[PDB]
Design a protein around this ligand. Structure first.
Ligand SMILES: Nc1ncnc2c1ncn2[C@@H]1O[C@H](COP(=O)(O)OP(=O)(O)O)[C@@H](O)[C@H]1O
Ligand SMILES: [Mg+2]
Ligand SMILES: [Zn+2]
Lengths: 193, 49
């Protein structure tokens, strides 16, 4: 199942939902929560309980009439002429699925030479501690402690397990309490973006 | 349609043949009426339902 994104919403409208079908190799990809582009076809599939009122329907061209004792009444007449209700729904078949915007060895191999050059340039800078604070939060004034804490939470720690069957946390949790208008929701919005 | 001469040597008795028939149901006593029979030496098969 896929959903229309927020940027495509018109005034006062709920996002549209659509069904996508994957066949064979393309079945693997497109996990839940992703934001992806699809390329394929738009195809019509029949439906059953759409018509509570009579609508378009099919029949046979043969000019056949009933005989006494076998008169083409309701049920028998409909079954004899092969009448089917024409109901339909729209379904999308996908042949290509891609990310809208795109195991350490695998990550290293995926990156190109220029991307790896940029990564290495970033790696050996002490100002990485400072510049990352200003880059993610350019407009918010002060509160550098909160920026450092949020960056540390983003990078996170290492999880471990012990021999007795217990487990140890590797994640970090952060709480912010403040007076009104102290840019408290701006950090949340920036991290969401 | 054909035209043929001949000499008649045998003639059976005059009998009765039905052209319109009506039948009745055993249980609800409903009726089917005014069923047209075919001319000539042709029969008719009663319905079952
Ligand atoms: N230190 C700051 N630097 C820049 N803008 C600020 C700062 N403090 C407050 N603001 C502005 O004031 C508003 C604060 O509202 P908000 O952060 O939603 O308050 P709260 O999160 O406490 O409900 C924001 O729109 C923000 O633009
Ligand atoms: Mg707020
Ligand atoms: Zn009956």
């Amino acid at each position: 199942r896929i959903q229309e994104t927020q940027a495509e919403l018109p005034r006062g409208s709920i996002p549209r939902s659509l069904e996508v079908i994957l066949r064979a190799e393309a079945v693997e990809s497109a996990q839940a929560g992703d934001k992806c582009d699809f390329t394929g076809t738009l195809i019509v599939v029949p439906d059953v309980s759409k018509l509570s009122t009579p609508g378009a329907r099919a029949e046979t061209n043969s000019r056949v009439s009933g005989v006494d004792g076998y008169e083409t009444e309701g049920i028998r007449g409909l079954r004899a002429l092969g009448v089917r209700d024409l109901s339909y729904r729209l379904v999308f078949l996908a042949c290509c699925v891609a990310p809208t915007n795109p195991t350490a060895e695998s990550i290293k191999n995926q990156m190109t030479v220029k991307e790896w050059e940029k990564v290495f340039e970033m790696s050996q800078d002490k100002n990485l501690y400072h510049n990352l604070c200003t880059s993610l939060f350019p407009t918010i004034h002060g509160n550098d402690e909160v920026k450092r804490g949020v960056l540390l939470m983003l990078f996170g720690g290492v999880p471990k397990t012990t021999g007795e069957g217990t487990s140890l946390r590797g994640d970090i949790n952060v709480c912010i309490v403040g007076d009104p208008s102290t840019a408290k929701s701006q950090f949340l919005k920036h991290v969401e973006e | 349609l054909v035209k043929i001469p001949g000499i008649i040597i045998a003639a059976s008795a005059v009998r009765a043949k039905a052209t319109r028939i009506s039948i009745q149901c055993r249980s609800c006593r409903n009726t089917l009426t005014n069923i047209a029979m075919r001319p000539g030496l042709e029969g008719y098969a009663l319905p079952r339902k």
